[PDB]
Chain A
Amino acid sequence: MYTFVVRDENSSVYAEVSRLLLATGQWKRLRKDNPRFNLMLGERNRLPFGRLGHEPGLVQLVNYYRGADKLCRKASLVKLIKTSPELSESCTWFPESYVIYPTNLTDEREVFLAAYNRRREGREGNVWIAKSSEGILISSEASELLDFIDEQGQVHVIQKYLEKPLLLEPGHRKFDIRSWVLVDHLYNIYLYREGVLRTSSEPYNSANFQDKTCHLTNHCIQKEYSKNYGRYEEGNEMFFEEFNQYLMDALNTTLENSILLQIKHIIRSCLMCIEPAISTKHLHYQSFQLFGFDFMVDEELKVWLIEVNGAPACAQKLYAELCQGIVDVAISSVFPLATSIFIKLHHHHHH
């Protein structure tokens, strides 16, 4: 009889995982502050990693990687890419990005305009987005960006806006791709074979960057502020079977060749970069964690990483499968009970 504790009550994924664990009849849930657990499904903020792994007679496992926030915060991700040799500034799949602190509060504001001006000079599309880790501005004029940033009080990021996105027809409309990645205690990287396209139901419009429902494919901003939520697909959600058949019919490619190769390359590069900082291979406790990677596809079928989410929810159709997979490869791998839905990402090129 294995034991576990639940310290995040607002998590779809791990609510479903707890229910499956109980249904096995080999897992017992304890009170959130009982220390004699095998498994901690922990809180998202200030999780006490320092108290794990000091319980004699208990192999202990937690569903977060201490240190993985460097990937999963806007400013820390841009810092990690620009400063890590294996990602480098010569990184072809991350959009040009700069970290900027409000005037109220290193910062990169000077270096940002250095390139902004050879895009003013150079005739190039000079549209940029500003975001923080609600509160988005898209503009071709830098000073609207900087002033909007200093109007707020937290650190923001300025990132090149991708002006030529791939657009689904019918609709002439934007989307982003969400991939779910499980990293187990052995640092196997498992991509869930089902992704989801969060589409916009509004046609794209390169002239008014201020009506942000053809520009922000977030399921929330589409579920209310947009007119056509659910026209083409249920809940602005296209899945991989459909998107693949579309690529085959319209572009004469597959999802595998034109997009997924890049996505796997990006996931493996990010996680292998931070692996020495977060691995629990020789630690007194062990970690796994579920990530959501968010990608954009431009019109030449080039994939761009937009961000990484350290605590993602699932698509409602997929919970059942994904959560069962989490118990299969992340939990029962460590604590055995009495056609994999994942692709293992591994590659050993010799040179």
Chain B
Amino acid sequence: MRECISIHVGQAGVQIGNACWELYCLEHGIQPDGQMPSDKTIGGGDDSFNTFFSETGAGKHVPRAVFVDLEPTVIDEVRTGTYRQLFHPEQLITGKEDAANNYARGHYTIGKEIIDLVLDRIRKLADQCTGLQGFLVFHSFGGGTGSGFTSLLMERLSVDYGKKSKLEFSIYPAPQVSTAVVEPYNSILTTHTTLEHSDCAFMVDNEAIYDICRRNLDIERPTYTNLNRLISQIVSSITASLRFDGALNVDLTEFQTNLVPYPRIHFPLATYAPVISAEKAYHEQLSVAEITNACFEPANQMVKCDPRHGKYMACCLLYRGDVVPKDVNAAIATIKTKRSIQFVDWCPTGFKVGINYQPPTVVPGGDLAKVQRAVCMLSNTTAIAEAWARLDHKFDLMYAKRAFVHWYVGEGMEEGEFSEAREDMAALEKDYEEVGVDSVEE
């Protein structure tokens, strides 16, 4: 067994962490007070679930988790809420004034005063590990803490744990729920500073989650609670192989090995099916063929984009529930003859498949229906660069006029960091294009 530490930064990181740890507890039969009746080795162990939970003599199972926010209101709701007892005070770190949606304020001004305390609390958790694999980091692109503080923390983690792996779960900004005009800036800035420090990053576009909630859950105006319960299902689908017995993606190193042949192109697209409303009176359960086919509909992706007009470098199918290999291979055979799935020349066309027989757990009273089988596809496709194209266009529109730049300069950032970050993004878009596209009045 090798442990993983989860780091949740800013409002989005913390609220998504809440939802994920709730789900994990439901999936492992851990009660809100931390007790786990089915764990028969009291006070210790090295089962698969111990990758994410440590144990006390009293039999309490404690998330290997740090929550960090630069203001207190959101972590205070963790301190006083349903899972109050799960977490130890030293794992919940707040400041008092936040980064005001300003990357430079979260990175340079307020980051500098809190980074050492955060690294010390992380070090406490790492001290209780016999063989740390590395880190799962949850945050938004758009917020001041999520962007700025996270990028500072990423650099320092590269310094203090230079051989550990680092995975990101990143909320990409969507105007339908966004809080600030400058979120394109923050996004580019944090991506620029975090790129070489991240081994694999899962982007979740709030716009895609929002439309999935409206279209398939029949929520007229989704809230962060709706969004986060759906995101937590996807995240749990991705980490289940670290937390359960199996042979696919069993450590963090394997995620890079299976999904990231080129280290800068480290943004796999997630696709999830089926999403079924719990208030849907009558539902016919979907087969292996149907849910696998739905993995190739853009409407089911975490980022809206079109993988037919790019190339695949890797593809992993993660199934939960009543699924056997023969039905998977039959569904894949059917799908490859009806869909545009092109791999880059220097990679085999194929799928890595993981099946866990326990179907998805859902939150009691949530929006998601229980289903008999579900799948999460992780594919590394150049088409995700469409999202970069969108961000970079908005950035260019504002920066050409230097709109809002003075907020960042006044925090001690130099204007040239804007064009450095933007040229790094231009290189990145160029890389995606090289890998994924060929030479192309009447």
- A312 CB-CB contact with B under 8 Å: yes
Q: How long is the Cα–Cα vector from A278 to B339 in the complex, in angstroms?
A: 11
- B386 CB-CB contact with A under 8 Å: yes
Of the candidates B298, B338, B386, B442, the one whose C-beta lies within 8 Å of that of A282 is B298
Q: Is the CB of A56 within 8 A of B175?
A: yes
Q: Is the CB of B386 within 8 A of A50?
A: yes
CB distance from B382 to the nearest CB of A (A): 11
- B403 CB-CB contact with A under 8 Å: no
Provide the residues of chain A in CB contact with B442, threshold 8 Å: 292, 309-313
Q: A49-B306, A56-B175, A277-B308 are in contact. Are A282 and B441 (CB under 8 A)?
A: no
Q: Is the CB of A50 within 8 A of B305?
A: yes
Q: Is the CB of A284 within 8 A of B441?
A: no
Q: Is the CB of B441 within 8 A of A51?
A: no
Q: Is the CB of A284 within 8 A of B309?
A: no
* A-B contact number at CB 8 A: 51
- B440 CB-CB contact with A under 8 Å: yes
Of the candidates B207, B309, B440, B441, the one whose C-beta lies within 8 Å of that of A49 is B309
Q: Is the CB of B304 within 8 A of A284?
A: yes
Q: How long is the Cα–Cα vector from A73 to B440 in the complex, in angstroms?
A: 8
- B340 CB-CB contact with A under 8 Å: yes
Q: Is the CB of A51 within 8 A of B389?
A: yes
Q: Is the CB of B389 within 8 A of A48?
A: yes
Provide the residues of chain B in CB contact with A48, threshold 8 Å: 389, 393
Task: Specify the chain B residue showing the minimal Cβ separation from A178.
Answer: B442
Within 8 A of A (CB), among B139-176: 175-176
CB distance from B380 to the nearest CB of A (A): 17
Within 8 A of A (CB), among B251-301: 297-299
Provide the residues of chain A in CB contact with B441, threshold 8 Å: 10-12, 311, 313
Q: How long is the Cα–Cα vector from A244 to B176 in the complex, in angstroms?
A: 58
Within 8 A of A (CB), among B362-393: 385-386, 389-390, 393
Within 8 A of B (CB), among A26-77: 48-51, 53-54, 56, 66-67, 69, 73, 76
Q: Is the CB of A276 within 8 A of B393?
A: no
Provide the residues of chain B in CB contact with A309, threshold 8 Å: 442
Q: Is the CB of B298 within 8 A of A284?
A: yes
Within 8 A of B (CB), among A59-108: 66-67, 69, 73, 76
Provide the residues of chain B in CB contact with A207, threshold 8 Å: none
Within 8 A of B (CB), among A7-28: 10-12
Q: How long is the Cα–Cα vector from A105 to B306 in the complex, in angstroms?
A: 31
Provide the residues of chain B in CB contact with A73, threshold 8 Å: 440
CB distance from A157 to the nearest CB of B (A): 15
Within 8 A of B (CB), among A84-136: none
Q: A282-B298, A283-B298 are in contact. Are A56 and B304 (CB under 8 A)?
A: no
Provide the residues of chain A in CB contact with B309, threshold 8 Å: 49, 66-67
Q: Is the CB of A66 within 8 A of B306?
A: yes
Q: Is the CB of B304 within 8 A of A54?
A: yes
Q: Is the CB of B390 within 8 A of A276?
A: no
Q: How long is the Cα–Cα vector from A313 to B175 in the complex, in angstroms?
A: 39
Q: Chain A, 277-315, contact with B by CB distance < 8 Å: what is the 0/1 string? A: 110001110000000100000000000000001111100
Within 8 A of B (CB), among A299-351: 309-313
Interface residues on A, range: 20 to 34
Q: Is the CB of A282 within 8 A of B297?
A: yes
Q: Is the CB of A276 within 8 A of B339?
A: yes
Q: How long is the Cα–Cα vector from A282 to B305 in the complex, in angstroms?
A: 12
CB distance from A176 to the nearest CB of B (A): 12
Q: Is the CB of B308 within 8 A of A282?
A: no
CB distance from A135 to the nearest CB of B (A): 15
Provide the residues of chain A in CB contact with B338, threshold 8 Å: 276
Provide the residues of chain A in CB contact with B393, threshold 8 Å: 48, 51
Provide the residues of chain A in CB contact with B175, threshold 8 Å: 56
Within 8 A of A (CB), among B408-442: 440-442
Q: How long is the Cα–Cα vector from A249 to B439 in the complex, in angstroms?
A: 49
Task: Specify the chain B residue showing the minimal Cβ separation from A291.
Answer: B442
Q: Is the CB of A276 within 8 A of B340?
A: yes
CB distance from B346 to the nearest CB of A (A): 15
Q: How long is the Cα–Cα vector from A276 to B441 in the complex, in angstroms?
A: 27
Q: How long is the Cα–Cα vector from A48 to B308 in the complex, in angstroms?
A: 15
Of the candidates A54, A277, A278, A292, the one whose C-beta lies within 8 Å of that of B390 is A54
Q: Chain A, 238-278, contact with B by CB distance < 8 Å: what is the 0/1 string? A: 00000000000000000000000000000000000000111
Q: How long is the Cα–Cα vector from A186 to B369 in the complex, in angstroms?
A: 32
Provide the residues of chain B in CB contact with A56, threshold 8 Å: 175-176, 207
Q: How long is the Cα–Cα vector from A56 to B386 in the complex, in angstroms?
A: 17
Task: Specify the chain A residue showing the minimal Cβ separation from B397.
Answer: A33
CB distance from A30 to the nearest CB of B (A): 15
CB distance from A315 to the nearest CB of B (A): 12
CB distance from B370 to the nearest CB of A (A): 26
Q: How long is the Cα–Cα vector from A48 to B306 in the complex, in angstroms?
A: 13
Q: A284-B298, A292-B442 are in contact. Are A54 and B308 (CB under 8 A)?
A: no
Q: How long is the Cα–Cα vector from A277 to B176 in the complex, in angstroms?
A: 30
Q: How long is the Cα–Cα vector from A11 to B442 in the complex, in angstroms?
A: 10
Provide the residues of chain A in CB contact with B176, threshold 8 Å: 56
Task: Specify the chain B residue showing the minimal Cβ separation from A85.
Answer: B337
Residue among B306, B308, B389 facing the most chain A CB atoms (10 A cut-off): B306
Q: How long is the Cα–Cα vector from A17 to B304 in the complex, in angstroms?
A: 30
Q: How long is the Cα–Cα vector from A54 to B338 in the complex, in angstroms?
A: 27
Q: Is the CB of B340 within 8 A of A50?
A: no
CB distance from B74 to the nearest CB of A (A): 26
Q: How long is the Cα–Cα vector from A139 to B207 in the complex, in angstroms?
A: 58
Provide the residues of chain B in CB contact with A310, threshold 8 Å: 442
Task: Specify the chain A residue showing the minimal Cβ separation from B383.
Answer: A50
Q: How long is the Cα–Cα vector from A282 to B440 in the complex, in angstroms?
A: 26
Residue among A51, A53, A277, A284 facing the most chain B CB atoms (10 A cut-off): A284
Q: How long is the Cα–Cα vector from A312 to B441 in the complex, in angstroms?
A: 6
CB distance from A6 to the nearest CB of B (A): 16
Q: Is the CB of B308 within 8 A of A67?
A: yes
Q: How long is the Cα–Cα vector from A66 to B386 in the complex, in angstroms?
A: 13
Q: How long is the Cα–Cα vector from A67 to B339 in the complex, in angstroms?
A: 14
Q: How long is the Cα–Cα vector from A282 to B304 in the complex, in angstroms?
A: 11
CB distance from B195 to the nearest CB of A (A): 20
Q: How long is the Cα–Cα vector from A115 to B338 in the complex, in angstroms?
A: 33
Task: Specify the chain B residue showing the minimal Cβ separation from A45.
Answer: B440
Within 8 A of A (CB), among B304-331: 304-306, 308-309
Q: Is the CB of A69 within 8 A of B390?
A: no
The interface of chain A, by Cβ under 8 A from chain B, is: 10-12, 48-51, 53-54, 56, 66-67, 69, 73, 76, 276-278, 282-284, 292, 309-313
The 4 closest A-B pairs by CB, nearest first: A50-B386, A309-B442, A50-B389, A277-B340
The interface of chain B, by Cβ under 8 A from chain A, is: 175-176, 207, 297-299, 304-306, 308-309, 338-340, 385-386, 389-390, 393, 440-442
Known: A66-B306, A276-B338, A282-B299. 7 other contacts (CB 8 A): A10-B441, A49-B306, A50-B305, A54-B390, A277-B308, A283-B306, A284-B298
Q: Could you list 20 A-B pairs, sorted by A, with CB under 8 Å?
A: A10-B441, A49-B306, A50-B390, A51-B389, A54-B304, A54-B390, A56-B175, A56-B176, A56-B207, A73-B440, A76-B440, A276-B339, A278-B308, A282-B297, A282-B298, A284-B304, A292-B442, A310-B442, A311-B442, A313-B442
